Design a protein around this nucleic acid. Structure first.
Ligand SMILES: Cc1cn([C@H]2C[C@H](O)[C@@H](COP(=O)(O)OP(=O)(O)OP(=O)(O)O)O2)c(=O)[nH]c1=O
Lengths: 430, 249, 248, 253
DNA sequence: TAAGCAATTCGTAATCATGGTCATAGCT
DNA sequence: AGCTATGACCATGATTACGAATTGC
């Protein structure tokens, strides 16, 4: 409305509109002669892309149906016909399908959606249960492919290009399960996924969507087509990839978000056919990796064959602070809890990057790289108090009015660089 | 009103030529018995501790304890102006933000003024313990050794035993082994060995340690197990400059 | 056929190494009085006045009166090719645009035939004033005082009273306030009429004090609001004067 | 095995200092006569040759004529870790990947053992057979380094001419032709510039390399140059009666 | 009064390794 | 006082680090 959050998104709106006009001023200064060499180059590379468009594999994505709500619903039998909401009065993680139509979505505050539905319940989650109900599903997913790639706790890219051929010579009770025998599932590529959904159904007391595609980005959106408890399928043939690549908004694809949406509402893009019809425009306008992503999201291309940790953070928000001792003392708890969580995987980090947020919402990530590997609650804090010092005393007569501080260990080392691990001196001092 | 007359000016020039490359700012504690310095650098790997007590000053007086933060490159740019003979008269009032150096040639009486700052260096050091190997060796040789393995790698292996002590380094161009065998008046190598100890350190701090080379000619390396290496130089009749360094693995 | 043979060859070397930093091209006026130069720097503040008389040139012969334009960087890179114990023979003709140099060694002669140029000359005179204060100090001590003062700021305030000559500065750290009191070719002599306190800029005095190896001692010559003379006297050849103007 | 002790521990700190920016990889033919080296540089015009023969060594034993591929830049970074008056011993096994250097001070309390990882290459043994010359000029070393560092400020090419009465080093440029003229010496230490000749010489050479070739100037106190027609310039240094170091560079056009 | 993690993108800019130059000093 | 050594100071690509912005779940 007219909030501080409204003020900072107003400034961000000014900035994105300024970049809109800075793009339109570089859009007018091209001609019909500047649409020649770039178009020929990007379609020569698209000939090099589409000729070896190999899609003999069958990649399956398996989402869930309101995962953080559904795993509560397998553990809350009282209100199965009710709309549930996880989170609290600041932010929602995900709400269920009895409330999606009413507007109760993700990335929405706990006060925006709650004034829309007076009859609702909002209960904070239990983050330990989902880590087990993920692994229970992963037990079923490991059988159909050992190299499955769980992105989050629920999404799961699986490759069933090999399991299907080694299923043809099977009997009619190996391919038949029991309700918790029940209906026999066939040998087709739809049927293996029907089997997977049935096992995840009557082994977790829940439901799970799915999606079959020749590629990964197609699977991510086919998993959204027939969405609650449903599925979809595309056939591996170069004609049939084109009939679904049309008539799609770019509010649906992942990797094209909200601001790259508005920077393409300018050039007249809604469908991916229009997004294909601007080869020499988008190749000259946008950056290198972004026009790469646009030219490969145009023909529907991507990952034809499937494939450690690189950061670990703790951030924390709070009310308004205006003192000098409270920031220095509250950086220590965030150094300590992160030092607890850094040793459970036994990783030696060598960078601390604090990150502060004003009461009028500006990010300030102040980084510092050391040469001593950092593990413990006192070998971090003497790298972050010298950044809280540099950015408290650079406002020389005035305090910092922050609302969020957060530390971030990074640059975890290789096997070539974990045999020479230099140590800090603060282990030895007293 | 801190006031300190040093009739050998090159001692202070040599100290702040040693400390400006490794650390870059310091917080000197000046109290009624001498000047103390305690500073670990940015990466929190090494520590440097320094005491010059109030007896080798040709005159010293101080009435209340002062804490004086000093940019060491600013002070090493001011103290580049004295010759090798200037009677150096550091004065400083208590609650003023300027340190008045007054040089005096042996009548060219310069008078420089520096700005201080507010620095809060950490008020903790290594507690008093006992050490296992104490080598004492010519400091020109120690500087030659710490500058003669950085051409190989950034890891030194100091392996200490009874007949001598060995420095080895292994890097991408090969490896090297320098062996010190014990002696037969200041080329004297005395090894107070107890337990034969083998450790490994970073040469990018051992090369910055050897910039106090003309502050002595005898250096004591004092080692133990699971304990930082100590390199110690003694500023004659004045005090000491110690360097603690953490080991690898 | 102009010929100027100098027997202490290090003289011109220290001169031109004191001039190649400041001014780029300059005019050499060649006459029976000797070798003359007045030029300005490329920022129009400092005024270089080199005067060489004909008494101590070991052999002089100048019939007409010539003017030779030289770029001092190329002339000085030729004047880094002789030892500190050589005999210079500068030569010129009216039939050529080539300033010849010969370095004689007591059996390695060194011939050079440097290009001249043609500049648009400026003969500006200096009205001679009666100076308020003239000080004489050894050359190395002034070189040290300016070169150590340059690390502190750029605004040198030279003060003078009969008891003492008092250099000050300032900067981002604090004022390096050098003194020198009233005091054997290495003394400090102060001829004072009225006390002076006048501003200058150090970044050209640093270009000036590279004539320190010419003489053992320098003389500063000052008046109120008149540009000062910094004079380095070659013994029995002439002098080299630098003029600097005060600021504000 | 191969082990070679040499009492002058400064000669390898200077022979392997005149050869670190010029070349970067070479073939040390370690055989029964002594250490050799032959290498055209990274521009393939200047021919380094080097020989430390056997009889100048303190002690020396090998029978397997081995051929070590030696990286001179890393070897100079290791030999710059020795004292000047040390004593240097080389150690190699037969099928060895590495080579060991022994630096013993005459104080004898400190001993150094470095170990250098080798490589393997093949170099052209482009043999330089017996020739006869036209003019020989035998001169000081600081003088030749001074002459070339003078003329490299003027131009970047040098005419060298040798006649019965001496030599002219003539260097034109964009700013006027420098010229330095040297004559002989009759009845006089190091100052003697003895210039002998059968027929006069005017050749011409570059000066990007004669600021590299006279980097060998602490190795001796007299350099010699030799010249004729349709034969390259021979820049010869002698070492402390152990052998020699030649550089070869060809005329221009 | 508007989260909590992680991952990635580009353009800015800090530090480092590099050779060149200069000054002062041990050796001649 | 020149020759040479050599350590301080300085230009300077250049890799590496910093930081805001953007996307996901
Ligand atoms: C998108 C999003 C998800 N999550 C959490 C909550 C969800 O339960 C879980 C899964 O993300 P998603 O699977 O995309 O969302 P969902 O399964 O809740 O809803 P749908 O089935 O319609 O996709 O991850 C967040 O915490 N924050 C977010 O911004």
């Amino acid at each position: 409305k007219g909030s501080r959050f409204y003020g900072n998104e107003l400034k961000k709106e000014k900035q994105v509109n300024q970049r809109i006009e800075n793009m339109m001023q570089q859009k007018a200064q091209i001609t019909s002669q500047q649409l020649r060499k770039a178009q020929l180059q990007v379609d020569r590379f698209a000939m090099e892309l589409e000729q070896s468009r190999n899609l003999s594999n069958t990649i399956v994505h398996i989402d869930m149906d309101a995962f953080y709500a559904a795993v509560e619903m397998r553990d809350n039998p009282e209100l199965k016909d009710k709309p549930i909401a996880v989170g609290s009065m600041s932010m929602l993680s995900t709400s269920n399908y009895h409330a999606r139509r009413f507007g109760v979505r993700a990335a929405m505050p706990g006060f925006i959606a709650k004034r829309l539905c007076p009859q609702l319940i909002i209960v904070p989650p239990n983050f330990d249960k989902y880590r087990a109900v993920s692994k229970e599903v992963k037990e079923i997913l490991a059988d159909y492919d050992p190299n499955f790639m769980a992105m989050s706790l629920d999404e799961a890219y699986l490759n069933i290009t090999k399991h299907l051929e080694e299923r043809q010579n099977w009997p009619e009770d190996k391919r038949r399960y029991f309700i918790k025998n029940s209906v026999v599932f066939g040998t087709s590529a739809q049927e293996v996924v029907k089997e997977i959904r049935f096992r995840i159904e009557q082994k977790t007391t829940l439901t799970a969507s799915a999606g079959i595609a020749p590629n990964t980005m197609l699977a991510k959106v086919c998993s959204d087509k027939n969405k609650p408890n449903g599925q979809y399928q595309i056939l591996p043939n170069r004609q049939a990839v084109m009939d679904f690549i049309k008539d799609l908004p770019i509010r649906k694809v992942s990797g094209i978000g909200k601001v790259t949406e508005k920077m393409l509402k300018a050039l007249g893009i809604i469908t991916c056919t229009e997004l294909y019809q601007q080869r020499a425009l988008l190749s000259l306008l946008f950056s290198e990796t972004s026009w790469h992503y646009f030219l490969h999201i145009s023909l529907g291309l991507g990952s034809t064959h499937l494939t450690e940790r690189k950061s670990m953070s703790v951030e924390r928000t709070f009310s308004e602070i205006n003192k000098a001792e409270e920031q220095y003392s509250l950086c220590q708890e965030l150094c300590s809890e992160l030092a607890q969580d850094l040793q459970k995987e036994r990783l030696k980090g060598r960078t601390v990057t604090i990150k502060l947020k004003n009461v009028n919402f500006e990010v300030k990530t102040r980084a510092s790289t050391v040469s001593s590997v950092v593990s413990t609650a006192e070998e971090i804090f003497a790298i972050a108090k010298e950044l809280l010092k540099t950015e408290i005393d650079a406002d020389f007569p005035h305090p910092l009015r922050l609302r969020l501080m957060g530390v971030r260990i990074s640059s975890f080392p290789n096997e070539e660089d974990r045999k020479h691990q230099q140590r800090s001196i603060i282990g030895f001092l007293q | 009103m801190f006031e300190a007359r040093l009739v050998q000016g090159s001692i202070l020039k040599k100290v702040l030529e040693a400390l400006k490359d490794l650390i870059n700012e310091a917080c000197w504690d000046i109290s009624s018995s001498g000047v103390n310095l305690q500073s670990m650098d940015s990466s929190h790997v090494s520590l440097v501790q320094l005491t010059l007590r109030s007896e080798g000053f040709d005159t010293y007086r101080c009435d209340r304890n002062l804490a004086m933060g000093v940019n060491l490159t600013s002070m090493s740019k001011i103290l580049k102006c004295a010759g090798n003979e200037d009677i150096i008269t550091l004065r400083a009032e208590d609650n003023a933000d300027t340190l008045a150096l007054v040089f005096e040639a042996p009548e060219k009486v310069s008078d420089y003024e520096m700005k201080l700052m507010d620095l809060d260096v950490e008020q903790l050091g290594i507690p008093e313990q006992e050490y296992s190997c104490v080598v004492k060796m010519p400091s020109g040789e120690f500087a030659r050794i710490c500058r003669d393995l950085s051409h190989i790698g950034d890891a030194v292996v100091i392996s200490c035993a009874k007949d001598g002590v060995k420095f080895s380094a292994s890097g991408e161009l090969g490896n090297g082994n320098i062996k010190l065998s014990q002696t037969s008046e200041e080329e004297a190598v005395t090894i107070e060995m107890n337990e034969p100890v083998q450790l490994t350190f970073a040469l990018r701090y051992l090369n910055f340690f050897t910039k106090a080379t003309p502050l002595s000619s005898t250096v004591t390396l004092s080692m133990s197990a699971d304990v930082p290496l100590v390199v110690e130089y003694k500023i004659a009749d004045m005090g000491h400059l110690k360097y603690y360094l953490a080991p690898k693995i």
